[PDB]
Amino acid sequence: APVRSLNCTLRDSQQKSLVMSGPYELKALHLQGQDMEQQVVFSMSFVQGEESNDKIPVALGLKEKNLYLSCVLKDDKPTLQLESVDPKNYPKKKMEKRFVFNKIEINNKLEFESAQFPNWYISTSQAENMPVFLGGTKGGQDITDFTMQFVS
Ligand SMILES: Cc1cc(C(=O)NC[C@@H]2CCCO2)ns1
């Protein structure tokens, strides 16, 4: 059948929102009131992959954009990028592995682990207005826990 998707927003555990800045540039900042319109709305697709009660493979596309978060080696490191796709072909149930995150529910928060790069997570910095990145530990000063808000 089709792939199933939900619209949503994400905020890090310090309650920073994710907003688009430069071309293909996703950053996190503290946001409230009128400025909340600037936050990125995701289309979270439920995709093919290894699954358990608390570990659900997803893709994260930008709502009504042919852009997906992906995990690739860049200058020899697991990095987070926004990648363009053919809008006729996406989303799909069998997303390529670089697009797949394991959405993990622990203690009423979510972590998004790269399916391609085990133990690398969507991360934010404590500082305002810094890139969203792929970080190689769910431990230390960088933030790897999020909450989801469901959108119409
Ligand atoms: C100036 C700025 C640059 C970035 C930036 O490079 N963000 C990278 C993330 C990875 C996925 C897409 O965005 N944010 S503010």
What structural domains does the chain harbor?
A: 1-152 (2.80.10.50)
**DSSP class of residue 35?**
G
Is the bond preceding 91 in cis, omega lying within 30 degrees of 0?
yes
The neighbouring-strand residues paired with 141 are none
Query: CA 29 to CA 12: how far, in whole Å?
Result: 9
Three-state SS at 97: helix
Q: Report the pocket of ligand 1 as residue ranges, CB < 6 Å.
A: 21-22, 24-27, 69, 80-82, 131-132
The two tokens of residue 95 are 């997303």
Which resolution in angstroms does this entry have? 1.4
Query: CA 49 to CA 9: how far, in whole Å?
Result: 23
Burial class (CB in 10 A: 0-12, 13-18, 19+), 50: exposed
Q: Method of determination?
A: X-ray
Chain centroid to Cα 31, Å, comes to 18
User: Which atom number of ligand 1 is nearest to the Cα of residue 69?
Assistant: 11
Q: Whose CA is nearest to atom 6 of ligand 1?
A: 25
Query: CA 80 to CA 28: how far, in whole Å?
Result: 14
57 within 8 A of 103, measured Cβ to Cβ:
yes
Report how far ligand 1's centroid is from the alpha carbon of 11 (Å): 16
